Amino acid sequence: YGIKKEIEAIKKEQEAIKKKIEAIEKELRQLANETTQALQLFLRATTE
Amino acid sequence: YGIKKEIEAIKKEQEAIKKKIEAIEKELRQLANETTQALQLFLRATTE
Amino acid sequence: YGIKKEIEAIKKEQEAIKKKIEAIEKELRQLANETTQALQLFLRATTE
């Protein structure tokens, strides 16, 4: 029973980690988009 | 004993992973702040 | 055998996670470089 509960806890931790990574990927993509947009502004500005 | 040492190693790996993720979140936040600041400069420049 | 296969699966998941984190670090570094370059452009532009 003890090893079962140990393994169960570990797999709970992994699923939580996998979701943390998912959130990090989300925020990383947004940041990439924003920085691309921000650079597009500059590229628009240096033609004004 | 073998399974104990296996589980122990796995939980050592998880704690290390959790800290890696922590460091990634730190650097991601800094990068977001810097990019916001960098864009704020531009927004300041196109009013000069 | 069951616990062995469980532990084996968990360690497979950890290696996959470690590589996901590796890819995230790669993309995070690139993004930092690009944002630095993008800001360098602006710093070049406001001297023209």
Give the pair of three-digit tokens for residue A24: 């990090």
CA atoms within 13 A on the CB side of C37: 7
Check if B18 contacts A (Cβ < 8 Å). yes
Specify the 3-state DSSP secondary structure of C15.
Answer: helix
Backbone dihedral angles phi then psi of residue B25, each to the nearest 5 degrees: -65, -40
- Give the CA distances from residue C23 to residues A28, B24, C17, C18, C28, in Å, rounded to whole numbers and listed in that order: 12, 12, 10, 9, 8
Question: Residue B23's closest chain C neighbor by CA?
Answer: C25
Cα–Cα distance measured from residue C36 to residue B34, given in angstroms and rounded to the nearest whole number = 9
Structural domain count, chain A: 1
User: What is the dihedral sign for C-alpha C37, C38, C41, C46?
Assistant: negative
Q: A21: distance to nearest CA of chain C, Å?
A: 8
Domain that holds residue B13: 1-48
Block residue for tokens 């800290």? B19
Of B21, B31, B32, the CB nearest to A20: B21
Which experimental technique did the depositors report for determining this structure? X-ray
∠B43-B25-C43 over CA atoms, to 5°?
A: 25
Chain position carrying tokens 């570990």 = A10
Distance (Å, rounded) from C-alpha A10 to C-alpha A16?
Answer: 10
